[PDB]
């Protein structure tokens, strides 16, 4: 199963605030729609065609964001609000989704915030983030106050992760404002580039272990090196729209809710 974690191997700090997640409704919508689109033969062939012709002149991310394809799923609205421990009509002023992809994972968060900001490298992904009427900021413009800051599967796709986490604490509202973070495990970071080639990150984030279990036990050491404690955390399937050979694609996530301490 995608949701079980060996609780016995977890460190007691994390056992205390481990939220248990499951294949809820919202996850099923996504899976269903990922099976529906992976039946549209004409679409699945035009995605296959565009990407293969342009694969050596754009990054996959940019190609995925040119077609509106490869949309991904992290948490249902219900899952999201339970992790945060809030009400379905709860609301605040500012969200920030850093490296937001196509905004679909940002959409599921949007009804809880009045204003929405996001950053991104891919300029076709900036386009779709702007098609949703979000406010886009530069990679270094958002660190000049945000009520919630989102950093979902970016710490393994960016060059300066520790700077990011210290930058996040810089502009996060302190009294109540929380951050939500996701991280594919086992850890394997790289800086994607055009043509499938990639750069290695500049800063190194120390993730001990060979397993989801031991690896998350190494992150409390890290979240306070930038100024956060884990208020809650769960395990989710990092779902992605399939193609023509598979109806969807899964990866092993770990999502955290963080307070400034």
């Amino acid at each position: 199963q995608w949701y079980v974690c060996n609780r016995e191997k977890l460190c007691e700090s994390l056992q205390a605030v481990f939220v248990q997640s499951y294949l809820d409704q919202g996850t099923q919508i996504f899976l269903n729609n990922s099976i529906e689109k992976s039946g549209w033969a004409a679409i699945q062939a035009y995605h296959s065609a565009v990407s293969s012709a342009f694969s050596l002149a754009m990054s996959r991310t940019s190609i995925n964001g040119l077609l509106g394809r490869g949309s991904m799923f992290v948490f249902s609205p219900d899952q999201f609000q339970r992790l945060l421990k809030i009400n379905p009509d709860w609301k605040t002023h500012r969200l920030l989704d850093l490296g937001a992809g196509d905004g679909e994972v940002t959409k599921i968060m949007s009804p809880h915030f009045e204003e929405i900001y996001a950053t991104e490298l891919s300029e076709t992904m900036i386009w779709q983030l702007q098609k949703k009427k979000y406010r886009v900021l530069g990679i270094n413009e958002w660190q000049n106050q945000y009520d919630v800051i989102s950093c979902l599967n970016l710490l393994d796709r960016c060059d300066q992760p520790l700077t990011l986490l210290k930058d996040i604490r810089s502009v996060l509202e302190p009294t109540r404002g929380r951050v939500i973070l996701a991280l594919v495990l086992p850890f394997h970071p790289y800086v994607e580039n055009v043509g499938g080639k990639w750069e290695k990150p500049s800063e190194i984030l120390e993730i001990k272990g060979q397993n989801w279990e031991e690896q998350v036990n190494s992150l409390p050491e890290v979240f306070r090196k930038a100024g956060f404690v884990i208020e809650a955390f769960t395990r989710l399937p990092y779902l992605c729209e399939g193609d023509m050979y598979n109806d969807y694609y899964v990866l092993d996530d770990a999502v955290f809710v963080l307070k400034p301490v």
Binding site: S71, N153, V184, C240, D243, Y249
Partner: peptide, 6 residues
């Protein structure tokens, strides 16, 4: 092709 993240 496959996962958009990896």
């Amino acid at each position: 092709q496959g996962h958009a993240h990896g």
